[PDB]
Amino acid sequence: QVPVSVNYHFSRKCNKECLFCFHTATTSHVEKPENAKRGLTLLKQAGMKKINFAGGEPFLYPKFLGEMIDFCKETLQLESVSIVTNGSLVKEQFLQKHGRNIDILAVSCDSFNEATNIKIGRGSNVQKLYEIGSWCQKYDIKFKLNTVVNKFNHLEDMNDHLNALQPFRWKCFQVLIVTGENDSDKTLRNAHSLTISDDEFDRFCERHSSQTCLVPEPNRLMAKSYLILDEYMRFLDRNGQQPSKSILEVGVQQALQAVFWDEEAFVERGGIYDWNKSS
Ligand SMILES: O=c1ccn([C@@H]2O[C@H](COP(=O)(O)OP(=O)(O)OP(=O)(O)O)[C@@H](O)[C@H]2O)c(=O)[nH]1
Numbered sequence: 001q002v003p004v005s006v007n008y009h010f011s012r013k014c015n016k017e018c019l020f021c022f023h024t025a026t027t028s029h030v031e032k033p034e035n036a037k038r039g040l041t042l043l044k045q046a047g048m049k050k051i052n053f054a055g056g057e058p059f060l061y062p063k064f065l066g067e068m069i070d071f072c073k074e075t076l077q078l079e080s081v082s083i084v085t086n087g088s089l090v091k092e093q094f095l096q097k098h099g100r101n102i103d104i105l106a107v108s109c110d111s112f113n114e115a116t117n118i119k120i121g122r123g124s125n126v127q128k129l130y131e132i133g134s135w136c137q138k139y140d141i142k143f144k145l146n147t148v149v150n151k152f153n154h155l156e157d158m159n160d161h162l163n164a165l166q167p168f169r170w171k172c173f174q175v176l177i178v179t180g181e182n183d184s185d186k187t188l189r190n191a192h193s194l195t196i197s198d199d200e201f202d203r204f205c206e207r208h209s210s211q212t213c214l215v216p217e218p219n220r221l222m223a224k225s226y227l228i229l230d231e232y233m234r235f236l237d238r239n240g241q242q243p244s245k246s247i248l249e250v251g252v253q254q255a256l257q258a259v260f261w262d263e264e265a266f267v268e269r270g271g272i273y274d275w276n277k278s279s
Pocket residue numbers: 005006007022023052054082084106146169171178222223226227228238270271272
């Protein structure tokens with residue numbers, strides 16, 4: 001297997017408290033920028049073309065994030081560099097310094113009601129979201145949305161906002177139940193209350209049939225179709241077995257085979273696309 005698109009969850013720490021979080025703040029480890037430049041360079045030669053900087057909240061570590069996305073673009077010559085943010089801590093001066101090297105910026109908002117955001121776990125607003133879009137236009141970054149369809153917001157009509165906001169990519173996740181993260185009271189979270197049925201999700205997706213960018217991801221396709229990197233730089237298996245050893249201590253090949261990655265769901269959910277800043 002060739003790791004084309006990789007999600008580097010370099011930290012688990014965050015300033016929000018979404019009830020359904022499936023990458024909880026179980027540890028506060030973050031890698032040295034020396035070791036992270038090992039893994040990303042090791043992963044580039046292995047076949048990586050898109051990197052996604054996610055985790056807990058990546059803008060809690062703006063210096064690390066800034067050093068890596070510059071390294072990933074300028075010296076690694078990577079096809080596409082992405083970031084996924086909740087939007088609270090994003091600031092324009094960051095996009096001044098590094099926006100030349102950001103190819104896709106993904107702001108995730110689950111509702112446009114401040115009341116719904118409160119119930120889900122975002123205290124507050126949406127003016128920030130429109131602001132980041134304005135910044136993305138100025139600094140030539142591709143702007144995408146990530147909303148999670150859950151019990152609170154599965155009835156909403158988000159069309160009017162998405163025509164003006166107009167993202168090139170709009171992911172709608174059916175709430176996922178990662179075992180170990182948000183499947184019991186023992187864990188940091190418990191998302192079973194926010195679960196919605198297959199038809200509840202389809203009503204949401206069918207309601208936004210006017211949206212061309214809409215890319216749905218039910219639990220069929222989201223569960224085991226991602227290449228996830230720990231803060232310790234090890235691939236996470238979402239099939240049942242424990243995580244691999246670090247790519248820093250063993251290398252990419254041994255780490256990838258220690259994890260199940262369904263390349264068919266990867267292609268079905270639209271994992272390969274026009275991810276570059278051109279074309
Ligand atoms: O079990 C899982 C599954 C998924 N995830 C995480 O959910 C996040 C969803 O975030 P995205 O869907 O935006 O990842 P992406 O940038 O790679 O997608 P494309 O650009 O290719 O369209 C991903 O970063 C993934 O790692 C988990 O944390 N755990």
